[model samples]
Target: DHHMEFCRVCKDGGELLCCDTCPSSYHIHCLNPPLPEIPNGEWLCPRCTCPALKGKVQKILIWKWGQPPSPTPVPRPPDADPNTPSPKPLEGRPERQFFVKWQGMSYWHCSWVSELQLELHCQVMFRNYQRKNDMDEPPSGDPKFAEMEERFYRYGIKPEWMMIHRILNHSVDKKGHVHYLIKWRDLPYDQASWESEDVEIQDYDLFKQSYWNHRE
Candidate 1:
């Protein structure tokens, strides 16, 4: 019944289009080929576009709860051992999907996309997520992995989940809510996001204390 009050690309309050199918809306100015006028029939958002993404994927959002992304698909050689078949699913493991943000889209428009859908060239992007989440390590059974797993478990940052690597800065909104600019570990600075300090602090107490102690 309603359209977004804020623009997806700019994250500022303004006029935008309401999708015919999904709740997600978008700003006309943000589209690749900007909309000069509203469509006559129906405006289906990039989110509702079928047969995989029409919009460029931005990032797979990391969550505090639930499992991290499935291991990124590794490249295969043209010719390899005949006896060794491609790794098959262990079964009982359902397909995994990640909450993804589309390029130039606001948080409100974020949606869940299947890993298989993104497997086409999106593996590179997922690999970055795996690396940043500390899931880049080899499979378990290694003592080092176990050791790190133990430490990671104690810290509350899941080995496969993302956590705040560093607090770059903070800003208090007019409402006085403190938002911290977070640099994800092993992730580029450009991927950093401004998030509520309270939410993160609740998840990583040690990290918050460490950040406060070190920073004046």
Candidate 2:
């Protein structure tokens, strides 16, 4: 219907093509079909050209719930043997992972089912604290403490996934999460393996300043 108007892109006086979509117009010469009939198939502008991705729901490439990532393709060396050929599945295990919802972030708690029974006994103890905490800080504790809880574990912090990867040289398992390889042996343990130049725990403060802005 918007045809017989000046093409917005080429500024040519012609029947509007791609009338079914937004007011983006293309001249016959500019379009691939270059037909006066406006062709007979789906019409999209240059910016919207994604035939493969079109009409498909976008999704994050992540492991599904209750599923682990595919195992490493490379085989472990003969000396680096795990007694079991494969890891035992967590289904119906005596222990299960628990989730804590704090703000928009999630905190993970893994405890034996046996200990879950005692959680009720500590409910009162947990609530009996003298402070009505706000943010990450309790009433009397460091104000930053509240925000610190938000940091939790994400990749790329000090002692982050990359740091861990530097240690193990292969990813490892942590509860349900797969941690990148961290070579604890390779790095100086307890302290960084350097006399002068090494990443340290206090280094996280720098990370907080740059990456996290000292917030959780």
Candidate 3:
């Protein structure tokens, strides 16, 4: 019989509780690795409740864009700059997403994304470089991107230039101190015979630098 079971979180269906943190489901038995018979203390389903995220920053705004769809949101009121001319405006709004990167990892990320995002944010912040009021239009490039790029280089943050699917796995110890597993394309190209690559590398030191460089 197709009888419905109660959801633990929403508590009204046959479906399993979709964890608010990880947003995944599980059947009691099919939890595959069964939970130890322990009283509820910190029942973290694998993804969430990690010690790593405890003191770490969460949800840093990589950048904000202003175009037609994501039009600078009038952060400063339109009347504030009556002479300002707006660009074509982004057709669609930019989505807000949070991301994390492990330290000392070389991810063959695309090298052009930071420029694009920086330009968009600059356009949004300066209101198109005050083009309308100024008799001479400012240079076509965004200076804000230069500052941001400097920060990237000084502290060495990888640019999100390429549009590729990168794998971000995790390293969980017995006590549950999960380190990030970043499968950046910069990983060495090893042959099948090799168990692991032997090359000079730094441990998770870069993570702290990059993480600190970015605001959460």
**Model 2: how far residue 17 lies from native, Å:** 1.3
Better of 2 and 3 by TM-score: 2
Put down candidate 2 lDDT per residue, 1-216, tens digits, no spaces: 544367755677756666455566776544432333455677766435522221111111111112232332333446765774643322221221122222211111111111122233333422332133232321221654344343432211222321321221223245444232222323343322211113333343333234334233
Predicted candidate 1, C-alpha RMSD: 18.0
Model 3, 82-113: lDDT tens per residue?
67664332233333222222223232221222
Candidate 1, residue 71: CA error in Å? 36
What lDDT score goes with residue 150 in model 2? 38
What TM-score would each prediction reach against the true structure? Answer: 0.33, 0.23, 0.18
What TM value does model 1 have?
Answer: 0.33
Candidate 3 residue 166 C-alpha distance from true site, Å: 28
What order do you get sorting by TM-score, best first? Answer: 1, 2, 3
Compared with the true structure, the alpha-carbon lDDT of candidate 2 equals: 0.33
In candidate 3, stretches whose alpha carbon ends up further than 4 angstroms from where it belongs are 1-23, 36-41, 49-216
Rank ordering of all candidates by lDDT, starting from the highest: 1, 3, 2
